[PDB]
Design a protein around this ligand. Structure first.
Ligand SMILES: *Cc1cc(C*)cc(C*)c1
Lengths: 245, 16
């Protein structure tokens, strides 16, 4: 996350931190995800497409630090790793960038809600908030494009939904963005998602509820003028999510 | 695929 503020998992209790075993070389962070039910985390296919073996991956819930354990964290194995059969990346755009992980503890239980772990609601079919709406994104991604290290404490920031009309100005992304994506950015271009934040939640209030409206997917650079973050548009994937779940 | 322990190797970034 570029800009925004350091937060803690209690403020984003549906955030899932996904790691890979080595191999190796022990264990390194992969990407963020979101808890959408006790047994299921949703994330982005591009995070896993290179190493698609569920046995490599660990999922933590209730965790606020990248390389240190947090009181109230729980560790999970990945029982099923489900990637989108239609994932494609062009130059910079990722299409169908959505993935499902079925989680299970060694014991072998799904998640229990607690002050650090809660599920996040999915939107109803084709329900998205209005453009201009303020949403939150969260993650352990880079704090600057040029950094080589990742923050050790979870960050969040607030970005605003942009209309498709506007995002598909050539001046923005043009044709690279599809009705299967949403755009969101800072009106002053100083806060954004960055590498390491992929798979994480774009969360909005939408008719009563904190909702998973997007998954962090792609963009040109991070926090660059007229280059918003692009998110996978969850409300256009309900059937995908229902069948594979 | 590289060889790497690289975080989010196809994220906004980033070689791929
Ligand atoms: C070096 C590298 C690593 C990954 C995971 C993906 C690409 C394209 C390049």
């Amino acid at each position: 996350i570029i800009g925004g503020e350091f937060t803690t998992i209690e403020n984003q209790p549906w955030f899932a931190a996904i790691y890979r075993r080595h191999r190796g070389g022990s264990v390194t962070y992969v990407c963020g995800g979101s808890l959408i039910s006790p047994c299921w985390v949703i994330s982005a296919t591009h995070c896993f497409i290179d190493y698609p073996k569920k046995e490599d991956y660990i999922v933590y819930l209730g965790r606020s630090r990248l390389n240190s354990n947090t009181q109230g964290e729980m560790k999970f194995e990945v029982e099923n790793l489900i990637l989108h059969k239609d994932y494609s990346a062009d130059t910079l755009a990722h299409h169908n960038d959505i993935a499902l992980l079925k989680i299970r503890s060694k014991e072998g239980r799904c998640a229990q809600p607690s002050r650090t772990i809660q599920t996040i609601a999915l939107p109803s079919m084709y329900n998205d908030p209005q453009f201009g709406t303020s949403c939150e994104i969260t993650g352990f991604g880079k704090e600057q494009s040029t950094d080589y290290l990742y923050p050790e404490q979870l960050k969040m920031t607030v970005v605003k939904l942009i209309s498709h009309r506007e995002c598909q100005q050539p001046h923005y992304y043009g044709s690279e963005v599809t009705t299967k994506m949403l755009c969101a950015a800072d009106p002053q271009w100083k806060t954004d998602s960055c590498q390491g934040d992929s798979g994480g939640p774009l969360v909005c209030s939408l008719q009563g509820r904190m909702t998973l409206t997007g998954i962090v997917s792609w963009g040109r650079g991070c926090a660059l003028k007229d280059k918003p973050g692009v998110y996978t548009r969850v409300s256009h994937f309900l059937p995908w999510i229902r069948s594979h779940t | 695929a590289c060889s790497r322990y690289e975080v989010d190797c196809r994220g906004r970034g980033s070689a791929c």
